[PDB]
Each structure stands twice: as C-alpha cells, then as structure tokens.
C-alpha cells in the first residue's frame, strides 16, 4: 500500500533529494557538443560515490548497467549511457538521476539543450517543464491524483503536443518505485486521494509528435514511434498540510520550494 512518511523519514528524503538535485547542477558545464553520454555517466557516478558518499539507485536495478539514465532527442526515457553516443549542437538531452542516502531515495531529471537550440527543442522543453510546474501547483491534501493527470494532459494537448501514457510518476521512499502510480493523463482508472506525508514523483514525458512509443531491444531504451522529439522533467515531492514541498528543487528552478494553499 501507500506508505506515509514520518517526519524523520521526511528529513532523510530532503537530504537525498538535495543530493540528487546537486548532481544535476554539477553536470551542467560538461554538457557540450562532442562529449559522450558514457563520459557524463562516469562523471556523475564519481561525484555520487566519491564526493557525496552516496550511491546511485540505478546501478544494478533489475540489471541496469549504468549509474544514470541519459535520453537524447527521440529517446523517451531510460536511455543507457554509452561511450559511442556523442552529443551534437541542437540535441536536447535528459539526465535522470536517482540517489540513495541513508536508505532513502531522491529521483529527479531535467532537460539540457546542447549548443545552439532548435526552435522545436526549446519550445518542447519549456512546455514540458511548465506542465510539471502546473501539476506541482495543484498538489494538496484531499485532492484526487486523477485531477492532476487530467490537467497535465489538457495543458500539453492544447499546446499541440502529446503525453506518453506508459511510463509515469510513482511513490518513492525506502523503495525506488512505490505506490502509487502517478499517471500524466486523464484516466477513469485513477482514484487516489492525497494525504500529508505521502512522497512521490511527477515526471511527465511529452512528445512533439504522436503519443506512441516503442521499447528497444536493449530492454530499457524507450523511443517515440514516430521519431519525434520527446522531453521530460522530474521532481520528488512530499504532500504537506496545506500543499507540497519540492524535495529536489535546483537553483535554476523558477518555482518556489514550498507551495502553500489558502
Ligand atoms: C534504470 S531505473 C531509472 C528510473 C528513473 N529514475 P524513473 O523512476 O524516473 O523512471
Ligand atoms: Co527518474
Ligand atoms: Co522516477
Ligand atoms: Na529525449
């Protein structure tokens, strides 16, 4: 079932959350044309282990071979870092990090634009982030998760894009992927009322083209069926008494860390 975090649990999540956020802040300068994704993965891993004294939740999870997930352009999610995959001007890339500290998980991701952005690329990233922010602003006790997925969907579709159905947000804590499943679209199947102390991620994947996706033979990599660009952003949050707190907020986020309702 859905686990409710204690205040002590929450304090541990703030640390793990901030650690994950920090890897993203740190890597930025390395994201440039000509760098390989395998190299970004090594830099991230070194930092996590050697400086942070933490651990990557990804390494070995169901056999996942690397420390972070790096998805370029049409890759939806779960792209596997590789020494052979070099970044080019105009690429949009997602770096998804999940760190474990004192047994608690922190899961977050953001898009990076390599070199000179393309119009589509910039637009897609922006809209994707806005859709995540919109959802964040709605979080509060008593509301049904269904409403959030529906708002994201309506927003995204209104902008001419599509939302991926298959992958979604999830509870997180001592476990990497806990209940509940956080859908990024409107579904009659969803019936979950939020309560304070719940911790979960929101991580909408938006496609410039059609919603359909396909899983690669590697068993992890996900791509759009039509090869259109896909973007994603992710934050880990905790439901509070009058709103929410964003555990993985970064210096470049433009949303406040604590959102209060009244
Ligand atoms: C190789 S497991 C990686 C899982 C991602 N952090 P997420 O739970 O955001 O999809
Ligand atoms: Co993630
Ligand atoms: Co996640
Ligand atoms: Na992508």
Swiss-Prot record:
Cofactor comment text: Binds 2 divalent metal cations per subunit. Has a high-affinity and a low affinity metal-binding site. The true nature of the physiological cofactor is under debate. The enzyme is active with cobalt, zinc, manganese or divalent iron ions. Most likely, methionine aminopeptidases function as mononuclear Fe(2+)-metalloproteases under physiological conditions, and the catalytically relevant metal-binding site has been assigned to the histidine-containing high-affinity site.
Gene3D superfamilies, A to Z: Creatinase/methionine aminopeptidase superfamily
InterPro entries: Creatinase/aminopeptidase-like, Pept_M24, Pept_M24_MAP, Pept_M24A_MAP1
Keywords: Aminopeptidase, Hydrolase, Metal-binding, Protease
PROSITE patterns for the chain: MAP_1
Catalytic activities: Release of N-terminal amino acids, preferentially methionine, from peptides and arylamides
UniProt-recorded Gene Ontology molecular function terms: initiator methionyl aminopeptidase activity; metal ion binding; metalloaminopeptidase activity
Binding positions for a divalent metal cation 2 per the UniProt entry: 107, 170, 203, 234
Family: Belongs to the peptidase M24A family. Methionine aminopeptidase type 1 subfamily.
Functional summary from the UniProt entry: Removes the N-terminal methionine from nascent proteins. The N-terminal methionine is often cleaved when the second residue in the primary sequence is small and uncharged (Met-Ala-, Cys, Gly, Pro, Ser, Thr, or Val). Requires deformylation of the N(alpha)-formylated initiator methionine before it can be hydrolyzed.
Subunit structure: Monomer.
Protein name, per record: Methionine aminopeptidase
Gene name of this polypeptide: map
């Amino acid at each position: 079932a859905i686990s409710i975090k204690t205040p002590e649990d929450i304090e541990k999540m703030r640390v793990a959350g901030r650690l994950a956020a920090e890897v993203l802040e740190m890597i930025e300068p390395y994201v440039k044309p000509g760098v390989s994704t395998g190299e970004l993965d090594r830099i991230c891993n070194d930092y996590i282990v050697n400086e942070q004294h933490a651990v990557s939740a990804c390494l070995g999870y169901h056999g996942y071979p690397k420390s972070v997930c790096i998805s370029i352009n049409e890759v939806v999610c779960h792209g596997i870092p590789d020494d052979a995959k070099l970044l080019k001007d105009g690429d949009i890339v997602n770096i998804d990090v999940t760190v474990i500290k004192d047994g608690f998980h922190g899961d977050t991701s953001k898009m990076f634009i390599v070199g000179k952005p393309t119009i589509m690329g910039e637009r897609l990233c922006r809209i994707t982030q806005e859709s995540l922010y919109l959802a964040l602003r709605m979080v509060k006790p008593g509301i049904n998760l269904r409403e959030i997925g529906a708002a994201i969907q309506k927003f995204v579709e209104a902008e001419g894009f599509s939302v991926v159905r298959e992958y979604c947000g999830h509870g997180i804590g001592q476990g990497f992927h806990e209940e509940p499943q956080v859908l990024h679209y409107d579904s009659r199947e969803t019936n979950v009322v939020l309560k304070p102390g719940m911790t979960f991620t929101i991580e909408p994947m938006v496609n410039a083209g059609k919603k359909e996706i396909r899983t690669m033979k590697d068993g992890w990599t996900v791509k759009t069926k039509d090869r259109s660009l896909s973007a994603q952003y992710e934050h880990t949050i905790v439901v509070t008494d009058n709103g929410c707190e964003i555990l993985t907020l970064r210096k470049d986020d433009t949303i406040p860390a604590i959102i209060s309702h009244d």
